[PDB]
User: What shape does this take?
Amino acid sequence: QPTNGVGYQPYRVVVLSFELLHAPATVCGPKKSTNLVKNKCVNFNFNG
Amino acid sequence: TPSALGKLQDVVNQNAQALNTLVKQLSSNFGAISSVLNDILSRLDKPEA
Assistant: This one.
């Protein structure tokens, strides 16, 4: 109905699922790159 | 024979295998989602984490 109210109101979305940190890193969300400094404590970043 | 020098070899594998079963016990999940630090950091925000 158009007058459904609380407890009968309808849902319309395309439902999906994702399972993460169990996948290869094809396309992933970005951060700002630096250069490859050796023999210094740095931050490594690959899938979080 | 290899039967001689047995208990010094036994305490070498007791020390070495005790150190190595300490190291592979960091693969044990302990009721968490993982034993890995990085999964627990990346998958969750800090008050749930």
Q: What stands out?
A: The two ends of chain B are 56 Å apart (CA to CA). The longest helix of chain B spans residues 6-23. The helical segments of chain B are 6-23, 37-43.
